[PDB]
């Protein structure tokens, strides 16, 4: 067994560097600045993932600064960080040591879809609720993730615990300070991003979250396409042509362009006939052109679609307890504190 030691700083708690030892290193994925490793910490036996991110000498790394201040059961935990060399010669890389989670929402979704089966709705409810909580939490700091997609939703399939990860695009949005439009991944981008807006809000994450919900209900992405124009055609086929008033809420530079002229498809026909009507209702309040008309994450947690999760006797299909769903904090509740009446049921 090859043991490796490094000097590293705890992700949370005091800034005192400590000796960290790990072993059982093995490649588990590919990253944008080098491959991603798994390792086992010698002191606890816990598995971690180690991701390289490449340090800017001019700026503090934004992802590291965000990760150090987040503490939530549905967000991946930063255990340690340290600097090293790596792929490119002479380059210094930031290494983020994250708690390892073995699967993703995308893996589970593809497993059902390949089998031509639909994900059981109880899991759709559990996953989407946990994602909306993670989003309520980061949004309460003003932090927008900007790359919500199924592959960024870590999942422990045994316990049904979901954790949001990959904050490499996240940013604290400030009104009246522009943001690059080129973030968020194909299939999940809000139409104001497709239109190249620089003045969007955290509601781009809610659109992406609606895309994930629709995907879980359909067994395939709802707005596929390799170009923004192909993606927009799929959006227009569902929502219909945006009005000039809607376009001006998305990007007013686009109001006078020629768009495909298409009537909205009825929401009840977008999904299979036996899709639960509350899921369709929820989806229709997330996939809205007007960004301010989309539900907030906290409003989405309180939606009727999630009422089964507030039932005292709800259980996982495998017979286990559901994960923690009601340990809201003042921080997490701050966008609308008296939603706790729905959010925290009596037995909590």
């Amino acid at each position: 067994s090859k043991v490796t030691t490094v000097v590293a700083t705890p992700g949370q708690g005091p800034d005192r560097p400590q000796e960290v030892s790990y072993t059982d290193t093995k490649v588990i994925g590919n990253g944008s600045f080098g491959v991603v490793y798994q390792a086992k910490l010698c002191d606890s036996g816990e598995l971690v993932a180690i991701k390289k991110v490449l340090q800017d000498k001019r700026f503090k790394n934004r992802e590291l600064q965000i990760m150090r201040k987040l503490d939530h059961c549905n967000i991946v935990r930063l255990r340690y960080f340290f600097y090293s060399s790596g792929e490119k010669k002479d380059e210094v890389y930031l290494n983020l040591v994250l708690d390892y989670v073995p699967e993703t929402v995308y893996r589970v979704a593809r497993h059902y879809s390949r089998a031509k089966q639909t994900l059981p709705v109880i899991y759709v409810k559990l996953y989407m609720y946990q994602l909306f909580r993670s989003l309520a939490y980061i949004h309460s700091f003003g932090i927008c993730h900007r790359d919500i997609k199924p592959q960024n939703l870590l999942l422990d399939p045994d316990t049904a615990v979901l954790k949001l990860c990959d904050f490499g695009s996240a940013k604290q949005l400030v009104r009246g300070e522009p943001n690059v439009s080129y973030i968020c991944s194909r299939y999940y981008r809000a139409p104001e991003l497709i239109f190249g807006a620089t003045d969007y809000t955290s509601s781009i994450d809610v659109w992406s979250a609606g895309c994930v919900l629709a995907e879980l209900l359909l067994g395939q992405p709802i707005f596929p396409g390799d170009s923004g124009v192909d993606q927009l055609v799929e959006i227009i086929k569902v929502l219909g042509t945006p009005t000039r008033e809607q376009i001006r809420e998305m990007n007013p530079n686009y109001t006078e362009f020629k768009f495909p002229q298409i009537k909205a498809h009825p929401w009840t026909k977008v999904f299979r006939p036996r899709t639960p009507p509350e899921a369709i209702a929820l989806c229709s309040r997330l996939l809205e052109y007007t960004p301010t008309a989309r539900l907030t994450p906290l409003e989405a947690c309180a939606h009727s679609f999630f009422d089964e999760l507030r039932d005292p006797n709800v259980k996982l299909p495998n017979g286990r307890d559901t994960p923690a769903l009601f340990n809201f904090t003042t921080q997490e509740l701050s966008s609308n504190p008296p939603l706790a009446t729905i959010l925290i049921p009596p037995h909590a």
């Binding site: 699967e103 993703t104 893996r107 497993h111 592959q151």
Partner: peptide, 11 residues
């Protein structure tokens, strides 16, 4: 496909 990890219990 577009998977995060190389390995999975579902493949």
């Amino acid at each position: 496909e577009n998977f995060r990890f190389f390995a999975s219990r579902y493949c």
